[PDB]
Amino acid sequence: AQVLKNRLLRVELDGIMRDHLARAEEIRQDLDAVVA
């Protein structure tokens, strides 16, 4: 019956689990431009 709500909420949690590495990637890739 209601695993579709679990599907939408699992889409939500993989979204918020991708957004954290989306936050981390450019911050980790700006700390390499101070070396010159």
Partner: peptide, 29 residues
């Protein structure tokens, strides 16, 4: 040379937090 320590323990901590969030997924389902 203090740029190779703090940002490095930062990315190590985030690399542990992503495994913690995968464990949070395994807590969810």
């Amino acid at each position: 040379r203090f740029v190779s320590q703090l940002r490095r323990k930062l990315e190590r901590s985030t690399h542990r937090l992503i495994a913690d969030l995968e464990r949070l997924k395994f807590l969810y389902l």
